[PDB]
Design a protein that fits this description.
Endoglucanase cel5A, mainly beta, Jelly Rolls, globular, monomer, 5-stranded antiparallel sheet
């Protein structure tokens, strides 16, 4: 299956690492929002974007003894203005493919004069 998480034209301005705030094109908080795709499946996240380089963040906030995970990943690869992020890649960054503690998923730009525009985000299942 292919699951559209967003389609349209979402623009994010972010011209440098100036502030402590870091704006996103797309965010999910699994503990708080019903999920549009199944993290347990072998998935890839595909993002059609332009204007800035792009990063996917899987994060777990710090809770007692467990540290904050900020699994920021560059695309597994980019093709044709589409970034592809894989579960295996995400898992390697996150430390595991156990997402039972996952607090945050964010798609974010790196600094850009023009800002980043996302047109489509798709989760597809791979096997």
């Amino acid at each position: 299956g292919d699951i559209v998480l967003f389609s349209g034209s979402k623009h994010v301005e972010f011209t440098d690492w100036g502030g402590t705030d870091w704006p996103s094109a797309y965010e999910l908080q699994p503990p708080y929002q019903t999920m549009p795709f199944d993290l347990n499946k072998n998935f890839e996240i595909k993002v059609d974007y332009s204007g800035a380089d792009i990063v996917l963040i899987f994060a777990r906030w710090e809770h007692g003894s467990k540290p904050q995970i900020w699994a920021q990943i560059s695309p597994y690869y980019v093709v044709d203005g589409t970034a592809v992020f894989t579960k295996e890649q995400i898992a390697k960054a996150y430390g595991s493919d156990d997402f039972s503690d996952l607090d945050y998923i964010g798609v974010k730009p790196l600094p850009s004069a023009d800002g980043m525009t996302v047109t489509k985000i798709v989760a597809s299942y791979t096997s």
